[PDB]
Amino acid sequence: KGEELFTGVVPILVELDGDVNGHKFSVRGEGEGDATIGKLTLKFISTTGKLPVPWPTLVTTLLQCFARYPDHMKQHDFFKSAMPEGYVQCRTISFKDDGKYKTRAVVKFEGDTLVNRIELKGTDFKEDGNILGHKLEYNFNSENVYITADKQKNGIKANFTVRHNVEDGSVQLADHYQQNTPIGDGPVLLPDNHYLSYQTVLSKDPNEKRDHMVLLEFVTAAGITLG
Protein backbone atom coordinates (compact mmCIF):
# COMPACT_ATOMS: atom_id res chain seq x y z
CA LYS A 1 0.00 0.00 0.00
CA GLY A 2 2.82 2.40 0.85
CA GLU A 3 4.64 1.34 -2.30
CA GLU A 4 1.61 2.32 -4.42
CA LEU A 5 2.26 6.00 -3.59
CA PHE A 6 5.56 5.83 -5.53
CA THR A 7 4.48 4.43 -8.90
CA GLY A 8 4.76 7.82 -10.61
CA VAL A 9 6.56 11.13 -10.15
CA VAL A 10 6.15 12.60 -6.66
CA PRO A 11 6.71 16.31 -5.91
CA ILE A 12 9.03 16.95 -2.97
CA LEU A 13 9.36 19.75 -0.42
CA VAL A 14 12.39 19.95 1.90
CA GLU A 15 12.74 22.35 4.84
CA LEU A 16 15.92 22.45 6.95
CA ASP A 17 16.54 24.65 9.97
CA GLY A 18 20.17 24.56 10.98
CA ASP A 19 22.45 25.72 13.75
CA VAL A 20 26.20 24.99 13.75
CA ASN A 21 28.30 26.28 16.66
CA GLY A 22 25.52 28.85 17.08
CA HIS A 23 25.52 30.03 13.44
CA LYS A 24 21.90 29.70 12.28
CA PHE A 25 20.76 29.01 8.72
CA SER A 26 17.72 27.81 6.78
CA VAL A 27 17.49 25.83 3.53
CA ARG A 28 14.39 25.26 1.43
CA GLY A 29 14.37 22.61 -1.28
CA GLU A 30 11.98 21.44 -3.95
CA GLY A 31 11.94 18.88 -6.73
CA GLU A 32 10.59 15.48 -7.59
CA GLY A 33 11.23 11.80 -7.06
CA ASP A 34 10.67 8.89 -9.43
CA ALA A 35 11.18 5.71 -7.42
CA THR A 36 10.53 3.50 -10.47
CA ILE A 37 14.02 4.45 -11.70
CA GLY A 38 15.46 5.46 -8.31
CA LYS A 39 15.77 9.11 -9.36
CA LEU A 40 15.71 12.28 -7.24
CA THR A 41 16.10 15.79 -8.65
CA LEU A 42 16.16 18.62 -6.11
CA LYS A 43 17.14 22.28 -5.92
CA PHE A 44 17.97 23.75 -2.50
CA ILE A 45 18.14 27.47 -1.69
CA SER A 46 19.51 29.20 1.38
CA THR A 47 16.92 31.62 2.74
CA THR A 48 19.44 33.11 5.18
CA GLY A 49 22.31 34.17 2.90
CA LYS A 50 25.62 32.40 2.38
CA LEU A 51 25.68 29.19 4.44
CA PRO A 52 28.11 28.84 7.38
CA VAL A 53 28.93 25.25 6.28
CA PRO A 54 29.73 23.76 2.84
CA TRP A 55 26.82 22.48 0.76
CA PRO A 56 28.39 19.01 0.31
CA THR A 57 28.18 18.44 4.09
CA LEU A 58 24.37 18.83 3.87
CA VAL A 59 23.77 16.45 0.94
CA THR A 60 22.94 13.36 3.00
CA THR A 61 20.67 15.36 5.32
CA LEU A 62 18.70 17.13 2.57
CA LEU A 63 14.46 10.84 0.84
CA GLN A 64 15.48 7.20 0.74
CA CYS A 65 11.86 6.29 0.05
CA PHE A 66 12.73 7.07 -3.59
CA ALA A 67 15.25 4.22 -3.80
CA ARG A 68 14.53 1.70 -6.54
CA TYR A 69 14.02 -1.66 -4.83
CA PRO A 70 14.25 -4.51 -7.39
CA ASP A 71 11.12 -6.66 -7.52
CA HIS A 72 12.89 -9.51 -5.71
CA MET A 73 13.78 -7.11 -2.84
CA LYS A 74 10.51 -5.21 -2.54
CA GLN A 75 9.65 -6.93 0.74
CA HIS A 76 12.76 -5.26 2.24
CA ASP A 77 11.69 -1.63 1.54
CA PHE A 78 11.01 -0.14 4.99
CA PHE A 79 10.91 3.41 3.63
CA LYS A 80 7.85 3.07 1.40
CA SER A 81 6.12 0.66 3.80
CA ALA A 82 5.99 3.42 6.46
CA MET A 83 4.09 5.72 4.06
CA PRO A 84 1.92 7.72 3.95
CA GLU A 85 2.08 8.31 7.72
CA GLY A 86 5.86 8.55 7.29
CA TYR A 87 8.97 8.00 9.36
CA VAL A 88 11.40 9.89 11.57
CA GLN A 89 15.02 9.83 10.39
CA CYS A 90 17.76 10.65 12.92
CA ARG A 91 21.48 10.85 12.25
CA THR A 92 24.68 11.67 14.06
CA ILE A 93 27.32 12.77 11.56
CA SER A 94 30.79 12.89 13.08
CA PHE A 95 33.39 14.83 11.08
CA LYS A 96 36.79 13.31 11.80
CA ASP A 97 39.01 15.64 13.86
CA ASP A 98 36.14 18.15 13.86
CA GLY A 99 32.56 18.62 15.04
CA LYS A 100 29.33 16.69 14.61
CA TYR A 101 25.86 17.22 13.17
CA LYS A 102 22.81 15.76 14.87
CA THR A 103 19.74 15.73 12.65
CA ARG A 104 16.09 14.82 13.10
CA ALA A 105 13.81 14.68 10.06
CA VAL A 106 10.10 13.98 9.67
CA VAL A 107 9.38 12.47 6.24
CA LYS A 108 5.73 12.07 5.28
CA PHE A 109 3.06 12.89 2.73
CA GLU A 110 1.06 16.11 2.91
CA GLY A 111 -1.51 15.45 0.22
CA ASP A 112 0.39 14.49 -2.92
CA THR A 113 3.65 16.14 -1.81
CA LEU A 114 6.35 14.22 0.04
CA VAL A 115 7.62 16.60 2.75
CA ASN A 116 11.00 16.30 4.52
CA ARG A 117 11.22 18.69 7.50
CA ILE A 118 14.60 18.65 9.22
CA GLU A 119 16.30 20.15 12.27
CA LEU A 120 20.11 20.13 12.30
CA LYS A 121 22.35 20.98 15.27
CA GLY A 122 26.12 21.16 14.83
CA THR A 123 28.54 21.26 17.75
CA ASP A 124 32.26 21.13 18.53
CA PHE A 125 33.39 22.46 15.15
CA LYS A 126 36.73 24.18 14.65
CA GLU A 127 36.46 27.78 13.46
CA ASP A 128 39.36 27.15 11.04
CA GLY A 129 38.51 23.53 10.22
CA ASN A 130 37.42 22.17 6.87
CA ILE A 131 33.72 22.82 7.62
CA LEU A 132 33.45 26.27 9.20
CA GLY A 133 36.47 27.28 7.11
CA HIS A 134 34.79 26.20 3.83
CA LYS A 135 37.67 24.04 2.61
CA LEU A 136 35.62 21.30 0.88
CA GLU A 137 35.25 20.87 -2.87
CA TYR A 138 31.82 21.18 -4.47
CA ASN A 139 31.52 17.53 -5.44
CA PHE A 140 30.43 14.22 -3.98
CA ASN A 141 31.83 10.68 -3.81
CA SER A 142 28.87 8.30 -3.68
CA GLU A 143 29.15 4.76 -2.28
CA ASN A 144 26.91 2.29 -0.40
CA VAL A 145 24.62 2.80 2.61
CA TYR A 146 24.46 -0.42 4.65
CA ILE A 147 21.03 -1.10 6.18
CA THR A 148 20.04 -3.44 9.00
CA ALA A 149 16.76 -4.02 10.84
CA ASP A 150 16.17 -2.86 14.43
CA LYS A 151 13.20 -5.00 15.49
CA GLN A 152 13.16 -3.68 19.06
CA LYS A 153 12.65 -0.12 17.78
CA ASN A 154 10.41 -1.32 14.90
CA GLY A 155 12.71 0.39 12.39
CA ILE A 156 16.08 0.32 10.68
CA LYS A 157 19.64 1.46 11.27
CA ALA A 158 22.21 2.52 8.71
CA ASN A 159 25.92 3.26 8.76
CA PHE A 160 28.26 4.77 6.19
CA THR A 161 31.19 7.15 5.81
CA VAL A 162 31.22 10.03 3.36
CA ARG A 163 34.66 11.04 2.07
CA HIS A 164 34.59 14.78 1.36
CA ASN A 165 37.34 16.05 -0.94
CA VAL A 166 39.32 18.87 0.66
CA GLU A 167 40.75 21.67 -1.49
CA ASP A 168 44.32 20.69 -0.50
CA GLY A 169 43.95 17.14 -1.85
CA SER A 170 43.19 15.53 1.51
CA VAL A 171 39.90 13.85 2.46
CA GLN A 172 37.49 14.89 5.24
CA LEU A 173 35.65 11.88 6.70
CA ALA A 174 32.02 12.13 7.80
CA ASP A 175 30.86 9.08 9.79
CA HIS A 176 27.07 8.71 9.56
CA TYR A 177 24.99 6.82 12.10
CA GLN A 178 21.35 6.65 11.04
CA GLN A 179 18.10 5.45 12.62
CA ASN A 180 14.61 5.41 11.07
CA THR A 181 11.40 4.69 12.96
CA PRO A 182 7.85 4.74 11.56
CA ILE A 183 5.35 7.35 12.69
CA GLY A 184 2.31 5.14 12.26
CA ASP A 185 1.26 2.25 14.46
CA GLY A 186 0.73 -0.40 11.78
CA PRO A 187 3.29 -3.08 10.89
CA VAL A 188 6.02 -2.10 8.45
CA LEU A 189 8.44 -4.11 6.37
CA LEU A 190 11.69 -4.73 8.21
CA PRO A 191 14.58 -5.75 5.97
CA ASP A 192 17.31 -8.30 5.88
CA ASN A 193 20.76 -6.75 5.65
CA HIS A 194 21.22 -5.02 2.29
CA TYR A 195 22.54 -1.74 0.95
CA LEU A 196 21.57 1.26 -1.15
CA SER A 197 24.00 2.16 -3.94
CA TYR A 198 24.20 5.88 -4.75
CA GLN A 199 25.12 7.95 -7.78
CA THR A 200 25.16 11.63 -6.77
CA VAL A 201 25.82 14.73 -8.90
CA LEU A 202 25.96 18.31 -7.55
CA SER A 203 25.54 21.28 -9.86
CA LYS A 204 24.43 24.92 -10.04
CA ASP A 205 21.55 26.82 -11.64
CA PRO A 206 23.20 29.62 -13.66
CA ASN A 207 20.07 31.77 -13.21
CA GLU A 208 19.85 31.44 -9.41
CA LYS A 209 21.19 34.43 -7.47
CA ARG A 210 20.79 32.90 -4.00
CA ASP A 211 23.28 30.50 -2.46
CA HIS A 212 22.03 27.14 -3.67
CA MET A 213 22.69 23.53 -4.63
CA VAL A 214 21.22 21.41 -7.42
CA LEU A 215 21.21 17.73 -6.47
CA LEU A 216 20.69 14.68 -8.70
CA GLU A 217 20.61 11.26 -7.04
CA PHE A 218 20.12 7.76 -8.42
CA VAL A 219 19.59 5.18 -5.68
CA THR A 220 19.28 1.40 -6.10
CA ALA A 221 18.82 -1.24 -3.43
CA ALA A 222 21.09 -4.25 -3.73
CA GLY A 223 22.73 -7.07 -1.80
CA ILE A 224 19.95 -9.68 -1.79
CA THR A 225 20.45 -12.24 -4.54
CA LEU A 226 17.96 -12.43 -7.41
CA GLY A 227 18.98 -16.11 -7.86
From TrEMBL:
SUPFAM superfamilies: GFP-like. It comes from the Eukaryota. GO terms for biological process: bioluminescence; generation of precursor metabolites and energy. The keyword Coiled coil does not apply. Keywords: Chromophore, Luminescence, Photoprotein. Coiled coil: none annotated. The keyword RNA-binding does not apply. Belongs to the GFP family. This is Yellow fluorescent protein. It comes from Aequorea victoria.
